[PDB]
Point group: C3
Chain length 268, copies 3
């Protein structure tokens, strides 16, 4: 615990000053109207203000020569500070998975946001799932046994209900097993509903780059907790916080604006 | 959790090195004598050593053009890092109140230190009281209904005992209510007694600028807890910590020296 | 809670990136073989990589003119950030003891690592023991009453079993008493056994400079907890963390390599 003087770390200064924008829930009606005017231009400004948040943070792991083929996109790289570090065997660079711990409402490790695994990273994906005791997966878009072995880990599917759909697997170290529930997702009703569905039961959330839909989902889960326990809304401040842990969370003005659309609904 | 190398933030370095001065309570007699000698000159040095603590911290919110009329004094401005951020409606700058969270003995949000509200900030004052769930106010010197509405908040007075005096109000959102107890204060006996009085029952503490009497009060409350649970005294280190969260806490050598006078008494 | 941008504090950057090297316990057999090859050369590289960790941290207290005679060696000085600060009487510099809080598995104050006391620091040593509520001492190599007074503290010996050996003392403020147990230590069996012995019963650990054997002991205690609760090993990351709080913890390649020898055993 230390405070910083002005001038040391500009990023830290942004954080103290304008990292957050609280609205009481009983004023969100009036406020949402204000921002959906001149065609969303108010939300476009909040969204533009967030654009540089957290992008100055180091990402050495992700940029090493050996870890190039483990990243789906070159512009979506995990920040060193929040990345998920796997165990090691042959060299340090085994530890790498394009994945970050994201804060939820209750703690900082509530989520792992990650990209949809590559052919050459499926082994690492399941390793991550086992090592970090992952019990739920949220697929927001075929890396699973329709049992298959992936490295030192064996994955068996044990239930499939197609309605979104729900799947149950067992993950086992081939040298001990935990069970897993994956929630596969396929108006704002559907998103809000899909989440309340999910919440009955570290939550790994992936879309394709692990950033747009992934961010919208995590965000809405947090907003809902804040709407039920506090009686307030902070879309700006949640995305800010997500950006401080992984780049591009909520990737388009439309997703940002859409989050706000979901909130406006819950509030009625 | 990170440690800093030397040279990064001199303020942080001061904090690691000489931010604190512990005296066992059974040695405070001997020590107090030492500092009240050559006419208080020992306490004058501790007091001079504290003079620059925390003043290099950013205060952007407080210095914006729109927030000028919300500050009673121009030399008492809240640091960004600890300021109380209110909810928003028309623009960001609604969030502003000249107020800081101050640490108490038990946590960092134990107190809010603030200035005595201005005519144009009474609405914000009551909003702060409601939003941040304030149950006690400590007035250390007429912003209350002798019910009145202040913005979206309604304040009714429900009890007044004049002895110091004690008042009870109800604060209500005009769109849910909590009750409030205000302790209005009017030798070191009176201060020590006024506090023990207060403690039976986030505590908002205000004098005029929210800094001298405000700091002396908070400080003495902490010292007393430290004297009862630890068996030690750290006046220097408490003021240091208060300065790291709001400027000028304990504003004159006389208040500092007076805190020490109160301690010397409790110790007998 | 703040993250830092790249470039602010290189030490902090090292911490985010390569501060840690996790091995699942069921892979340590294969990994240990790899590092004991070309005559320990793999462990020599891990050990060389750790050599600069934490050495850029400020140590003002330890370097002041008045505190020179309180340090056994001039190259083993406590970092300001973790040093143990004693109470004061005649001036600030009374607070000084060549000692640092070291993190254990459960918290950051689990250990105090310190040098074997000097003739002119025995008073401070016992003061530290009393003030910081020390219940166990681990001697890893005659500062105790075979009752003697040391400053304002009286130390009586109450039990001595010679087998390593175990001693019990009572420490008393001569102006209240707690009891104390000292564990005096005299293959990897003996170290692992000596620890399990110790653990039945802030733990002060000292060798001569408070750094080699001291570090090996603390480290092995942490590794064992990590092997029992996680099912993993991180020798590199534990020493790293110890170096961030006191210099030279695990002082030779042989101690580092020996820690790994102890782990390899437990794993069988
Ligand atoms: Cl973090
Ligand atoms: Cl703070
Ligand atoms: Cl620390
Ligand atoms: Ni800390
Ligand atoms: Ni912390
Ligand atoms: Ni603070
Ligand atoms: Ni942290
Ligand atoms: Ni630390
Ligand atoms: Ni920092
Ligand atoms: Ni904090
Ligand atoms: Ni964080």
């Amino acid at each position: 615990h230390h405070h910083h003087s002005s001038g040391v770390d500009l990023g830290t200064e942004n954080l103290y000053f304008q990292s957050m924008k609280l609205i009481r829930v009983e004023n969100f009606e009036a406020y949402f109207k204000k921002q959906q005017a001149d065609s969303n231009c108010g939300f476009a400004e909040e969204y533009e203000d967030l654009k540089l948040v957290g992008i100055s943070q180091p990402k050495y792991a992700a940029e090493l020569a050996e870890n190039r083929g483990k990243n789906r996109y070159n512009n979506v790289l995990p920040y060193d500070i929040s990345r998920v570090k796997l165990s090691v065997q042959t060299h340090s660079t085994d530890d790498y998975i394009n994945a970050n711990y994201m804060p939820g409402y209750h703690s900082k490790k509530d989520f792992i946001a990650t990209q949809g695994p590559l052919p050459n990273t499926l082994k690492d994906f399941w390793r991550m799932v086992w090592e970090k005791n992952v019990y739920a997966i949220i697929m927001l878009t075929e890396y699973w046994p329709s049992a298959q072995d992936y490295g030192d880990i064996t994955v068996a599917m044990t239930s499939e209900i197609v309605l979104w759909t729900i799947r149950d697997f067992t993950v086992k170290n081939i040298q001990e097993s935990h069970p897993l529930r994956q929630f596969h997702f396929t108006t704002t009703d559907l998103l809000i509903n899909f989440r309340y569905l999910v919440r009955d039961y570290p939550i790994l959330v992936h879309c394709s780059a692990g950033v747009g839909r992934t961010g919208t989902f995590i965000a809405i889960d947090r907003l809902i907790y804040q709407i039920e326990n506090e009686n307030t809304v902070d879309v700006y401040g949640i995305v800010y916080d997500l950006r401080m842990h992984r780049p591009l969370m909520v990737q388009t003005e439309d997703q940002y604006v859409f989050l706000n659309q979901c909130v406006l609904d819950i509030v009625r």
